[PDB]
Amino acid sequence: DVVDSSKSFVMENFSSYHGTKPGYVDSIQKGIQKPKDDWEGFYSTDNKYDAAGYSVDNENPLSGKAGGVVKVTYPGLTKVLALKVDNAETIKKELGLSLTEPLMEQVGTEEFIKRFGDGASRVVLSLPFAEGSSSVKYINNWEQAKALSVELEINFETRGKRGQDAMYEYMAQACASCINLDWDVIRDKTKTKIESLKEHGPIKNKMSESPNKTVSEEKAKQYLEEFHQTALEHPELSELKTVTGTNPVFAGANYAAWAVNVAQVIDSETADNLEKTTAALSILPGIGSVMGIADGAVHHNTEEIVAQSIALSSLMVAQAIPLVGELVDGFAAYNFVESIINLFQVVHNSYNRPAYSPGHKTQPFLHDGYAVSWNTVEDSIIRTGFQGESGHDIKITAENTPLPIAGVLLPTIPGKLDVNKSKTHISVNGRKIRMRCRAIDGDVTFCRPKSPVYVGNGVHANLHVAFHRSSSEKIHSNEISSDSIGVLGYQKKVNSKLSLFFEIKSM
Amino acid sequence: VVDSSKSFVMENFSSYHGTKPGYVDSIQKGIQKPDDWEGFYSTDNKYDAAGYSVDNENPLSGKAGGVVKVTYPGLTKVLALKVDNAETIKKELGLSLTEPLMEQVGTEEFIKRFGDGASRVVLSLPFAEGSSSVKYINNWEQAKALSVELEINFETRGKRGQDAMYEYMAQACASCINLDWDVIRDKTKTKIESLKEHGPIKNKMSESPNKTVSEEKAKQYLEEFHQTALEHPELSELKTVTGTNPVFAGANYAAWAVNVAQVIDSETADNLEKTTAALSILPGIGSVMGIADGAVHHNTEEIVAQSIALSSLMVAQAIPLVGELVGFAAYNFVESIINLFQVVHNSYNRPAYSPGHKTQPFLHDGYAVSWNTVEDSIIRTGFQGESGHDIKITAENTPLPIAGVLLPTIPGKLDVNKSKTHISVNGRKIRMRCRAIDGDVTFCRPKSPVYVGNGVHANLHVAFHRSSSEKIHSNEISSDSIGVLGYQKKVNSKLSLFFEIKSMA
């Protein structure tokens, strides 16, 4: 019951990876030893890029140096025992172990290695590494881990790069879409741009026109938006001017709101220390405006445009420190650039990692105040290759006032996929509402509720979509245009569009 | 597939059937039919049955018929099913995969194997998500045995609109919006008339271009009208209760009235069902209804009448500026909006989990957070050992931070397992540094920056350790929620996931 046989195997020269903190990259290669409770043991993973994320200075985890990644290998045969649950008690009861001795102590006995090892010399436990990941984590008994041989995958400190660039440049190989930026180039171009802009003519003439004394947030954002406009005319920011001109997330006013907000929270104690600056910056809103990240996309994905945005942000913080600050320099050009760069790398890394987009599987689709999601993963799958019925639950609510649900657009395929008009319905806080379904064309049925549906704070709906298949012939991608069910919200003549994405699969 | 805990035998088994206008008296002569689920449908909940009683040709606005109670004499087996897929049911319960399920249900061999001696079988299924009622599926021929008596005839109450049905449905709650819609209709007609002759308002209709204009100007005139109309003393209470919350501001009544006049043409204003279908798809109705932040604020007949009267006048004023017709404002507009009021009020009277409870999302400041599963939202007690709990987190557009999480602790009983507690961002696992704030609250910060946004989500895994098999008593626990902290504005955006303490089962 608790062992997943599909994830269990025996293997010769079983290898795994271990992230190593600075100062241990070379010592750990002399053998795994325990330092001077069911889960006490040596930890590793099958994904060396996830290993790399355990490698940062423990005293300065936000900003410190990354150590390395090493590869550990068991001689001979090793049993990888994948467990379906991470509760040790549940595991010891259901495997007939002694519920007293720790779980990882027993994993290392000869008696356990016989009952579960399949002839191998040792057992390693395997568990899901994390939600949203396909990696595994391996738990090794410490005594058994003395057999491991340890060699080097990478030493980030040996690369001799600034900040955490080496670690994140390594992690970006995972997707070698992919944001793979040369952060040496970006730093150098950033330094050059701040210098060449502080020594401009109208920028000089716009720093001349500055209150240069603690005024209210209002005059500050006004002057800062002015500065922004003036600074954006320089030819070293001309591409930035172009990619930030339409999307309102990238407007002067958000740069100004960013720079004001930075100056409010950065005092001298903080500005004096990189780790403290990064923590402070890392809890601010609006970092999307300077990163160029909006609508599910990293728009600023070239070294040149990123350097421009960071330089422009560097200037505006410099200008915002006297107007709404207790601080008295400099920070804008050094620790603020270091720190923001680190936050860039963090978010870029997130966007490079495989992830389900809004409205896919059980990820919510957030739009116009609505929140909609497939109730479970299986609901988002339209199974094919049988005659008969399926049902699919979509959750719907909204953030505050009552917003309508006008209906739902559903996919159909002549002969293979039909809306079951009798089982399809929508339920609002348990009130069950029937639907009037009408084909738009041969591929789309529109279903509208027979009484008004509203959702809002405290009011939710479950839309239950029922499909009927009149043939057992499978569906091929030729036949389906849409890959989404369109839930329609309020009308503005257009309807707000809430999309739930499905995949067609066999059993 | 049979849930034996919901299955029983009963003498004089009774249930309710919603009945559409025209058949209230006809149906009491006996249940007669006019594929796997062909059959007669009833429910254990007579207020849910009432929702089936509306004219099938004007389901939005039509007249409501009634509810009857049907009773089987002798013994009835209620067979509750764990699935509503007939194929799966016919396979697991060894039946002809050929014959319809509800035909087999009414055969003597079915009644032998499953009836427990009872004369006939009724199938029971969950009525709906978010509901605790059941639907009963009766074999048609077996249903001929039913005696049928009248629970209520909404048409006999002689009331306007769907008032009688919704007034019936409000009994389920005896917190309960139970409004007298007769009174609200009377007070509403009275105020529209009594505002139409006012001095300043008559003179604020004087200054109306009474000719098509730009929407941007239309809203300026109507916000003007709104301010002037709100000084009338028949609206004095409305002025007080709408003065602070920006959902209830004049600009929002103006947007409502403008959007109304845009979609009502002559064909539409002359037919109540078509008015209601058109009004029902507009945004902003919460401004008129006084509904915001999870609460029905306008919950008195007087204040609802005031709000509906004012909206009516403003619609009246917005049709010449932005519209195409005559009268609508005081006739079909009022009837239709009243029905939309009753729909939403009924939703708020029904039992429902609030945001952040069970798997209902908590939507705040652009974030969306929820418990992954119902069981995650329960902290079990009465044992020594561990539990884990998953919270989903994302945000609507740009990257927003997650600063940390506030967790409950109990000196000696409930502690944060700092090794297993972590947060994972698109699969990147991030350890946490946890530090007690007092004896009752721990604060865990992620050791790398966490951001969520469109396409970037997080799973917060909270693990709890109990060093005592003694149960937690409501006393020991101050909060009923886990506090996830977002961005700093000096305060953090507060995202609340509410839990319940329960013993093992």
TrEMBL record, chain B:
Domain Diphtheria toxin receptor-binding: 354-502
MF terms (GO), sorted A to Z: NAD+-diphthamide ADP-ribosyltransferase activity; toxin activity
CDD domains to which the protein is assigned, alphabetical: ADP_ribosyl
Annotated ranges, domain Diphtheria toxin catalytic: 1-174
GO cellular component terms attached to this protein's record: extracellular space
Bridged cysteine pairs (disulfide): 173-176, 434-444
Domain of life: Bacteria
InterPro entries: Diphtheria_tox_rcpt-bd_dom_sf, Diphtheria_tox_transloc_sf, Diphtheria_toxin, Diphtheria_toxin_catalytic_dom, Diphtheria_toxin_rcpt-bd_dom
Protein name (Swiss-Prot/TrEMBL): Diphtheria toxin
Phylogenetic placement of the source organism: Bacteria, Bacillati, Actinomycetota, Actinomycetes, Mycobacteriales
